[PDB]
Amino acid sequence: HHSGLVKMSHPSGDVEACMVQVTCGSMTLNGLWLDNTVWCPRHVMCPADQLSDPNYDALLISMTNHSFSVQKHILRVVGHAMQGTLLKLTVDVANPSTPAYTFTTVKPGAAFSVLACYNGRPTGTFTVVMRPNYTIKGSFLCGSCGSVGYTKEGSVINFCYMHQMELANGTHTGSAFDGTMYGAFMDKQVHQVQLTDKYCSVNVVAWLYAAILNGCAWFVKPNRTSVVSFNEWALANQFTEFVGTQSVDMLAVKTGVAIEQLLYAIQQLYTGFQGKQILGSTMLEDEFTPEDVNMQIM
Amino acid sequence: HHSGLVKMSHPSGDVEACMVQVTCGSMTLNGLWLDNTVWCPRHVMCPADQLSDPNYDALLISMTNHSFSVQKHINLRVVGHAMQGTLLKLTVDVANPSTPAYTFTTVKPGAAFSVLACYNGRPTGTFTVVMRPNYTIKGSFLCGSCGSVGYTKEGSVINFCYMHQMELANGTHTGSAFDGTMYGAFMDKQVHQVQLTDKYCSVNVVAWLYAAILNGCAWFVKPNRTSVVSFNEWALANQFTEFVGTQSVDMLAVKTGVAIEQLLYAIQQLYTGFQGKQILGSTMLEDEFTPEDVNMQIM
Numbered sequence: 001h002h003s004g005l006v007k008m009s010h011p012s013g014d015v016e017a018c019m020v021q022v023t024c025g026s027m028t029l030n031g032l033w034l035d036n037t038v039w040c041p042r043h044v045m046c047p048a049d050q051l052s053d054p055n056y057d058a059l060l061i062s063m064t065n066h067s068f069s070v071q072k073h074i075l076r077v078v079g080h081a082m083q084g085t086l087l088k089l090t091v092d093v094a095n096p097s098t099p100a101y102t103f104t105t106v107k108p109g110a111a112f113s114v115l116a117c118y119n120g121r122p123t124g125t126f127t128v129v130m131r132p133n134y135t136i137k138g139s140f141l142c143g144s145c146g147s148v149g150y151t152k153e154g155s156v157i158n159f160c161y162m163h164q165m166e167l168a169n170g171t172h173t174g175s176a177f178d179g180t181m182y183g184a185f186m187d188k189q190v191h192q193v194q195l196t197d198k199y200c201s202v203n204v205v206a207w208l209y210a211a212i213l214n215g216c217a218w219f220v221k222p223n224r225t226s227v228v229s230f231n232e233w234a235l236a237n238q239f240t241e242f243v244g245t246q247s248v249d250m251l252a253v254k255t256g257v258a259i260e261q262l263l264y265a266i267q268q269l270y271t272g273f274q275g276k277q278i279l280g281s282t283m284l285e286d287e288f289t290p291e292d293v294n295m296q297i298m
Numbered sequence: 299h300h301s302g303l304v305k306m307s308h309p310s311g312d313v314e315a316c317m318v319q320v321t322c323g324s325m326t327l328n329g330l331w332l333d334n335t336v337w338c339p340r341h342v343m344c345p346a347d348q349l350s351d352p353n354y355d356a357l358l359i360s361m362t363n364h365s366f367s368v369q370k371h372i373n374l375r376v377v378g379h380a381m382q383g384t385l386l387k388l389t390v391d392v393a394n395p396s397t398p399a400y401t402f403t404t405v406k407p408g409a410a411f412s413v414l415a416c417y418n419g420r421p422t423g424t425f426t427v428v429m430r431p432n433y434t435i436k437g438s439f440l441c442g443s444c445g446s447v448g449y450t451k452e453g454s455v456i457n458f459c460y461m462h463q464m465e466l467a468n469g470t471h472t473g474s475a476f477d478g479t480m481y482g483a484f485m486d487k488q489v490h491q492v493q494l495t496d497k498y499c500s501v502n503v504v505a506w507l508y509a510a511i512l513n514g515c516a517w518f519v520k521p522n523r524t525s526v527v528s529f530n531e532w533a534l535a536n537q538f539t540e541f542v543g544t545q546s547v548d549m550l551a552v553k554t555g556v557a558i559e560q561l562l563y564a565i566q567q568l569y570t571g572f573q574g575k576q577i578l579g580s581t582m583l584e585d586e587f588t589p590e591d592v593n594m595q596i597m
């Protein structure tokens with residue numbers, strides 16, 4: 001039985017309508033056009049020559065509104081400011097199709113949708129999970145900076161990510177819209193090292209619940225590890241503090257397999273699956289959220 | 299090292315603007331609005347009771363233009379109605395102002411396409427699937443999802459290729475092409491129907507192994523080769539599809555320097571297990587990434 005648990009993204013149409021190209025002398029990349037404001041990464045100010053140690057404050061000073069060209073494929077610039085790792089460009093035309101939106105900073109374990117763009121043209125969408133080491137996976141090539149990540153609560157779009165860089169290990173990171181870089185990485189072309197990843201406990205729990213709702217509940221025993229103990233246990237086993245949620249609880253009351261049963265399960269299962277499968281996997285999966293499971297097996 | 303090889307969908311905006319809701323008495327599901335035409339699954343005509351063998355030829359005659367309500371959320375007047383296989387072709391009196399350039403082409407097994415899952419005319423999610431050789435897809439579809447559509451995009455042209463119709467007992471799904479045929483010849487009757495045996499999509503498996511080589515993980519490549527002809531007759535007896543090359547596979551061979559026939563030999567050896575080794579994080583072969591996927595996502 002295919003559970004129907006898949007990596008599902010939000011319909012991107014709302015966001016497509018905001019994507020623009022931002023050009024500065026010789027660099028080009030994507031930006032996000034909301035009302036009168038175009039957001040893009042500041043390293044568009046930086047020529048290739050000087051990417052390992054750019055002086056962003058001097059670059060900005062050296063700039064004028066006419067340094068920035070903004071074009072829309074899928075506009076005159078009349079203001080320019082810096083906010084952390086991002087540029088805030090004021091343009092004379094407000095985006096009509098600006099959707100209701102907000103800015104949030106997502107925390108490790110949360111999923112969001114990414115609209116990968118190149119040269120202002122949206123080319124692909126996919127879902128990622130913000131790892132505990134504040135990187136994400138996904139697919140980003142040269143020219144993808146400016147691509148944006150978002151959730152939806154309603155028709156309200158919560159913009160959470162603007163893509164900036166690929167680490168040496170092939171994972172990725174970017175800015176939240178307050179201008180800070182997830183995981184404190186620097187926007188410089190300089191070797192930098194991710195912290196060690198961990199497992200998102202809450203997401204593992206939600207996956208084992210899916211398994212139960214799909215009629216694959218063999219791993220379920222009446223042994224129950226208390227929360228704070230599993231927490232202690234995890235600090236030493238590369239696992240995240242487990243925090244319950246209304247979403248998680250809802251899952252226990254549809255399965256009748258309360259959480260702590262599963263925390264215990266995680267311990268015995270972390271060792272190994274001892275010959276058996278869970279939803280066609282022999283390792284634990286942590287990229288499905290409480291919310292995905294409710295939404296997708298309802 | 300993270301390949302960057304992930305399940306990627308096309309941006310859905312083009313298709314979101316074509317999605318409507320179609321109502322016929324008690325049945326409600328999604329429809330696709332292109333120019334003056336609204337397409338939707340024909341079992342919207344069927345009352346909940348008659349669904350296990352309905353007489354679609356007589357439901358259709360019993361219907362007038364007023365028997366169908368069509369609402370745009372993301373109301374339209376039906377001025378004609380016709381049946382094309384398992385789908386309805388309704389005419390409405392307003393041309394969709396957001397119709398994208400488009401074609402109707404049926405996909406073959408192993409091809410991937412994007413799905414826009416919709417409930418009551420409202421797009422809720424998008425994901426990518428692979429048409430299996432048993433003519434089923436996986437994905438996520440709930441009560442109300444019928445009429446959700448699957449599509450690719452080449453240039454400015456959307457190719458519409460799927461309109462969702464049903465879930466099978468094993469939890470997989472199927473529907474029809476926009477020429478009206480059902481993939482796999484399943485019927486739009488509410489009866490237990492058994493799907494054919496699955497198989498591995500040899501061309502996609504090759505693509506994945508090229509993807510591994512591009513990611514640096516080439517430990518499985520030997521000089522040894524097995525020829526296309528010779529691979530396909532081995533395939534028949536081992537649950538694999540015929541391998542057919544494409545220009546897309548050829549680019550991967552040219553780029554890596556590894557010939558198709560080396561990877562066909564590797565597939566015969568890796569089928570029985572990896573013996574403790576991994577490939578792109580897997581201990582078994584992946585066949586749901588296409589040559590086109592790999593060229594796009596690694597280049």
Ligand SMILES: *[C@H](O)[C@H](C[C@@H]1CCNC1=O)NC(=O)[C@H](CC(C)C)NC(=O)OC1CCC(F)(F)CC1
Pocket residue numbers: 029043051140141142143144145146164165166167168169170172186187188189190
């Ligand atoms: C902006 O489009 C681009 C996105 C990168 C390019 C390849 N994949 C991506 O995600 N970002 C950069 O080019 C940045 C620029 C600095 C100023 C932030 N460079 C970058 O990511 O540097 C990486 C260091 C390690 C590496 F060599 F493996 C790849 C580039």
Ligand SMILES: *[C@H](O)[C@H](C[C@@H]1CCNC1=O)NC(=O)[C@H](CC(C)C)NC(=O)OC1CCC(F)(F)CC1
Pocket residue numbers: 327341349439440441442443444445463464465466467471485486487488
């Ligand atoms: C149309 O919206 C609906 C979509 C199904 C419902 C659950 N998941 C889906 O993808 N299609 C149907 O309900 C069809 C209708 C007939 C007339 C073609 N029937 C159907 O899929 O029934 C399934 C049989 C076995 C089952 F119970 F496991 C799931 C329902």
